[PDB]
Amino acid sequence: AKALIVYGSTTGNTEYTAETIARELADAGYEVDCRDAASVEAGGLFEGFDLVLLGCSTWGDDSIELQDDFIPLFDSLEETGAQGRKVACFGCGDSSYEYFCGAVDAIEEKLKNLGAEIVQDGLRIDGDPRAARDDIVGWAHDVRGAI
Ligand SMILES: Cc1cc2nc3c(=O)[nH]c(=O)nc-3n(C[C@H](O)[C@H](O)[C@H](O)COP(=O)(O)O)c2cc1C
């Protein structure tokens, strides 16, 4: 199985989450490519992957704002080869805000409307992902068991 993980992270929390997921998938035998959204180009990005995991923190407070490095990829998701692609989403946030992990919502809906197959409900991390490490591991298992 070949997996692509693409994350947007400002303070490193979604990046930690991405790397935790990456390690779980690699340890199970997947080929894993884990990239910062700041470094990627949208066109054809998902081609050749069995599974694509998109991670993004939520910003904005009074409105939903995607993590800033992820916005160009989000605005170009139509170019990535998402139709029929097996995908799932993750991200960090804080439930004291009105739109908790709203970026995960936004990315999931955009993917669904592009024809992607959402294989698991998104991973919505409240607070420090290091305090949710076992939820991350479990979700990574669940995703492997759903493709
Ligand atoms: C000023 C500010 C605004 C935020 N706004 C939101 C928000 O609207 N919704 C949310 O779920 N979390 C919100 N957060 C929480 C961030 O998503 C959280 O700090 C997250 O761990 C950052 O992940 P990152 O390091 O991958 O960027 C905000 C954080 C700050 C400091």
SSE inventory with pairings:
Layout: E1 2-8, H1 13-27, E2 31-36, E3 51-56, E4 58-59, E5 65-66, H2 71-75, E6 86-93, H3 102-113, E7 117-118, E8 123-126, H4 133-146
Parallel strand pairs: 1-2, 1-3, 3-6, 6-7, 6-8
Antiparallel strand pairs: 4-5
Bound molecules: flavin mononucleotide (FMN).
How is this structure best described in words?
The protein has helices at 13-27, 71-75, 102-113, 133-146, and strands spanning 2-8, 31-36, 51-56, 58-59, 65-66, 86-93, 117-118, 123-126. The chain has 147 residues and is of the alpha/beta class. The chain has a single domain (1-147), classed as Rossmann fold, CATH 3.40.50. Strand 4 (58-59) and strand 5 form a beta hairpin. The longest helix has 15 residues, at 13-27. The radius of gyration is 14 Å and the shape is globular. Bound molecules: flavin mononucleotide. Flavin mononucleotide (FMN) binds at residues 9-14, 57-61, 67, 92-94, 97, 99-102. Flavin mononucleotide binds at residues 9-14, 57-61, 67, 92-94, 97, 99-102. Residues 3-144 form the Flavodoxin-like domain. It comes from Nitratidesulfovibrio vulgaris (strain ATCC 29579 / DSM 644 / CCUG 34227 / NCIMB 8303 / VKM B-1760 / Hildenborough) (Desulfovibrio vulgaris). Its cofactor is FMN. Belongs to the flavodoxin family.
